[PDB]
Design a protein around this nucleic acid. Sequence first.
RNA 1: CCCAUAGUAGGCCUAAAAGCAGCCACCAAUUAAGAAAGCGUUCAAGCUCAACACCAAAAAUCCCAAACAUAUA
Lengths: 38, 167, 95, 170, 152, 80, 192, 221, 43
Amino acid sequence: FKNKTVLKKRCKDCYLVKRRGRWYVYCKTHPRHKQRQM
Amino acid sequence: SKAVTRHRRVMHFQRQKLMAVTEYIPPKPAIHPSCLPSPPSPPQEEIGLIRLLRREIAAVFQDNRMIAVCQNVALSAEDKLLMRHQLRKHKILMKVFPNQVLKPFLEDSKYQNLLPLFVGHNMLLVSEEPKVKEMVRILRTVPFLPLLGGCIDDTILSRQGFINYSK
Amino acid sequence: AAALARLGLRPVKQVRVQFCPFEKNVESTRTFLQTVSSEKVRSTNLNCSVIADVRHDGSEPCVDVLFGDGHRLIMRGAHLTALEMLTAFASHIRA
Amino acid sequence: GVIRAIVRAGLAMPGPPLGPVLGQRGVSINQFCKEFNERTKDIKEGIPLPTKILVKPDRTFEIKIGQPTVSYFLKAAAGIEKGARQTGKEVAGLVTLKHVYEIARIKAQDEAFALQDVPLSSVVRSIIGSARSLGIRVVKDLEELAAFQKERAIFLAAQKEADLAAQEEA
Amino acid sequence: FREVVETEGKTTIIEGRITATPKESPNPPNPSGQCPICRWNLKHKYNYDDVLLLSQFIRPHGGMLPRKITGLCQEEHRKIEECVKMAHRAGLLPNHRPRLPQLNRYLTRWAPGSVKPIYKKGPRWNRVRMPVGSPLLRDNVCYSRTPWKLYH
Amino acid sequence: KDPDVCTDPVQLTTYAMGVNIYKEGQDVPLKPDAEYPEWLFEMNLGPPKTLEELDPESREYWRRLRKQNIWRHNRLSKNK
Amino acid sequence: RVNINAALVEDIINLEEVNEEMKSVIEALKDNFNKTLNIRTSPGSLDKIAVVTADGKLALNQISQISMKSPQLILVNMASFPECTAAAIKAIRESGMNLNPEVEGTLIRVPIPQVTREHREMLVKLAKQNTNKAKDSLRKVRTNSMNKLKKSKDTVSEDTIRLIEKQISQMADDTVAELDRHLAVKTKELLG
Amino acid sequence: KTLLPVPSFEDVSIPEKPKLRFIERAPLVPKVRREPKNLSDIRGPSTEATEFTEGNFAILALGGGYLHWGHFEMMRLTINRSMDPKNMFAIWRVPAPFKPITRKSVGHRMGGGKGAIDHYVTPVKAGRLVVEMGGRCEFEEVQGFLDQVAHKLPFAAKAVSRGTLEKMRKDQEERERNNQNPWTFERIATANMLGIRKVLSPYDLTHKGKYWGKFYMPKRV
Amino acid sequence: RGRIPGRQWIGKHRRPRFVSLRAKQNMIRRLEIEAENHYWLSM
RNA sequence: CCCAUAGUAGGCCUAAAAGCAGCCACCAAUUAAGAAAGCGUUCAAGCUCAACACCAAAAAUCCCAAACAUAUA
Ligand SMILES: [Mg+2]
Ligand SMILES: [Mg+2]
Ligand SMILES: [Mg+2]
Ligand SMILES: [Zn+2]
Ligand SMILES: [Zn+2]
């Protein structure tokens, strides 16, 4: 999915975490909010 | 090249040595300023909120007859407003107050047997004359009674005490 | 609370909570009572029933649950906390 | 679920706004209109009032009703103005404390006020707060409203002629 | 501490029982200290190998304890959490292997699997040097004259 | 939809219209002294006075303070 | 490949006028294409049908409207008066579009029957010939511009002259590319 | 809950034109004389818009640079979009573009005389204010669009209030007073302790350590 | 890989030299000597 | 985390401006809930917030010295 240097929570359901060495943002309600950290 | 440039013009080696020598070395104590010192806090001022609240609770207790408390069931807003409707039809004065401010008053109002009672959410209801039968029949018409350890006429009674006093 | 109402707590039938208002380790049971008396949890199930005993005899709060399947759950809510009891309740609902 | 909205005791046959929503809720426009008329036409016609309705999973409904609108009552007590430009500040509309008392008496019938204790001071505060937004001033022991009526007539004449000029310019 | 157990035909019983609560020593060396490191003179004089105190601030599965209960500084809390990650990765705590139904290693800041290998290392002036330890223990007293070299 | 009719100014002064909720229409009595209690007499007609003079202990004082707080909070949130 | 622009000493040639003339040629070609009949109903009818009732000419657009609802049955509204209805009817009937005028109140139904594949042929060839005339106009314009440019090769530097030549050539290339774009687009439209 | 008071005021009076004034690409009288490429107008601190005027919240420039009609249009349009005119008013402290620059024909050899004019630009130095804002507004709600405008700007900039600017100044002052390093470019350069006046400039005697070219290093003390 | 454009020490892009505590202590020593020189030149 | 009653769909021209088309005010009921902060609805509806309670990175012949965390300047 999309890779951004800076991350942003679009909706409250968006939750950001640190997985396999990078920052991720996941939202099950709005999967299009998924956002990788470059 | 020119002096002013879009990119950072690399400086001379001596100049970079000088700039590497000259920095702000922050003056720090040998001890971190948090772990050891422990500065005391100021005497925080008291507020008109708690002033008026104390005055109001005094006017309540030293003027009424029967006191009771029941855990906040937290039912719907409209249903609770209907509740309050019939309770005020039955004349009972029902309010809430923050425990954080009510406990100190209870520690010097000669009510130190109630301090363990109040914790979390609750609903305090008072009368000038006993409405025990009607309040208890409401609170057993509801599917569960939330009442607990209320006090009437300067006498602490339990649920069974309330039933006895109602009969 | 929110998760419990979302999962709907359908199989449960009866929920007793009994305690003494003057015992100390009771605020956990009181919070359990509060979250169970919340609006949505009781609105999801009208056939279900909750009963709060404020019996003063003794010094031991207790919780009890009876399900539609018939399973019988009991909690000694003296040395237990509200969120823990709720997690256990949700797990046994899943059961 | 539940729907709370204004209704007219005079005209309720088509229900352009109510018809669609009622259909999506499943209740019958005819049945709802009949149940409305049964209790509205025997008392009044041509008046707005709020009403609460609720649809059940078995479609059954019961139409509870309170009192009419403070807005309508004040509009009837004072001259028809329908607010105005620069409202709230200016002194459009005249009412007295006897009108205040009587409208408190008639709002005591309200369901929400019947549900609540609604002390008379609280009712007064509520109604004066409404009047301040409607653009209505409450004079104590007023007299000679005729000059004010002429002033407001001239004001409305200016309003309508300015509206005509704006329409012509547009 | 309290131990909870959930146990019967068609019936089940959940019960929590208190347990033996250990205590600290009765002679705090440094009074007027709000954090234990300051109470015992352990602010800049600990590491990963000295796990005796680390065993105090961990759960049997190997989990870190909360600051609100332990009563530590924020900096010291992150210090000890990183240090405990280091200890686990080195494998000095076999008994705390968490829950169920190959290589020696030590001084590992980050996780092994997460890191990607450097298929190319740049020149001297912009080399991709390898991390070691953490800047958190940088303040630790260094008896040697040269400082700790954290990036290889 | 709209009201039926508005009466004369003197008639409205004598009696309040729209008070009767029945079709017949009725005139309401009137009296200044007994119809008005003391709190109604002392009730203020002007806008709510300013926080500069609202008593620190009065409930409406802190009500106004909370209102201003929520107003500024809403402004900050809108601007984001 | 590369695009070149000169905004400097040039004294004897003006490029703004050349660009204006090329754009005017493109505009005339677009006008001729829009005049060319199409399969879709009433592109040009509303905007280029002429009425005769008044001494001063007025387009059918100005008296009528294009606020219609259904494509299957096409109406046209008479905006000003319910008496220029007949005027617009006669104008549409005399127009060389071969439509069907019918009158109702102050609105006019206009059923469109399809024009005579060879109609597409004729329309595409009209478009092609308009393109050819536009290209000829562009050629003559640019040739005259180059003539008045090279009129003063002597005094002015040769490099400036030849780079201005390059610029004019590239501008004409862009122009003809746009012309071909329009021609192909509307040829596909006619065939659609 | 602990409740605090809300700031009250009546000294604010919004002008008739709260919106920002249109900025022309160049003056109505283009100067025929073309000027040199002088950079001292970008190098060094500023002295004209260091302080505030009838405003509360502004944009501050840390590094110097030019500004052209693109930047002007960006600022104007975005501020007019995000601003409520009745509640806030904005003004420019930056004068219009007057400094000309020239750019010869592209793909042209070197020489042949100085190129002709293309457009004009406004210079800006460090420590200078560019846009001021006042009204019934705090700084927090304004941070958003002000600092996004700052990030859009070419040179480094910030949103700032009077309190925050005073904070910055006083903290830099206490840092230069309390630095434990006995050696500071002030002393070393004013004494010429190692002949480093070779590598250094006469400008450095006052642009001592904070500045390098047009840039500005605030942490440098 | 990792080449430097043109010559290694001149131009718009050169090889970035960096300073070490060695050179830092050397130059601060020289600066202290210069301070003592200032002092003895005074009075 | 928590929960969020309503006077009132405040009034103004529209098909409605129910809080969100826009303009005027923005008071007021409950100790508490903005004549409505963000979503959303043609309009409504409906959902949260405030309130009260509890407590930094890419290119081309094959990366590039190798290694190191601790024994006193
Ligand atoms: Mg030079
Ligand atoms: Mg070279
Ligand atoms: Mg909330
Ligand atoms: Zn999301
Ligand atoms: Zn410490």
